[PDB]
Design a binder for this molecule. Structure first.
Ligand SMILES: Nc1ccc2sccc2c1
Length: 118
């Protein structure tokens, strides 16, 4: 049925190219839509630099590194943590980026992850 982890290659997008700048309007919604878009292959990743977060829509969904030992074929193990008004629901490791819908924008790279589905 549903393995706990799935290997994915996510398109990395520059923030100014992103057309849909968040997944929804609550913490529960953004996590739910992030997971659906991951399942459908319509999820992109924006790497965080200065000025990136203010250009995206809260609540944010981050992918964070969940394990230090495991990266099969560079698929870094990650889990999802959401943020609303400065509070994060969950705790994990280093932030690898912020997830956004992908609607056909051209990426600058692909990031390989081993995603904890829940
Ligand atoms: N195949 C696939 C890819 C990503 C995700 S996220 C939750 C379920 C799921 C399934």
């Amino acid at each position: 049925m549903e393995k706990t982890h799935v290997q994915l290659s996510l398109p990395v997008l520059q923030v100014r190219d992103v057309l849909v700048r968040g997944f929804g309007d609550s913490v529960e919604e953004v996590l739910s839509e992030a997971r659906q878009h991951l399942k459908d292959g319509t999820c992109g990743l924006v790497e965080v630099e200065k000025g990136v977060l203010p250009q995206l829509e809260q609540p944010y969904v981050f992918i964070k590194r969940s394990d230090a030992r495991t990266a099969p074929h560079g698929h870094v193990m990650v889990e999802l943590v959401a943020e609303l008004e400065g509070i994060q629901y969950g705790r994990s490791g280093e932030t690898l980026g912020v997830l956004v819908p992908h609607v056909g924008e051209i990426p600058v790279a692909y990031r390989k992850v081993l995603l904890r589905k829940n």
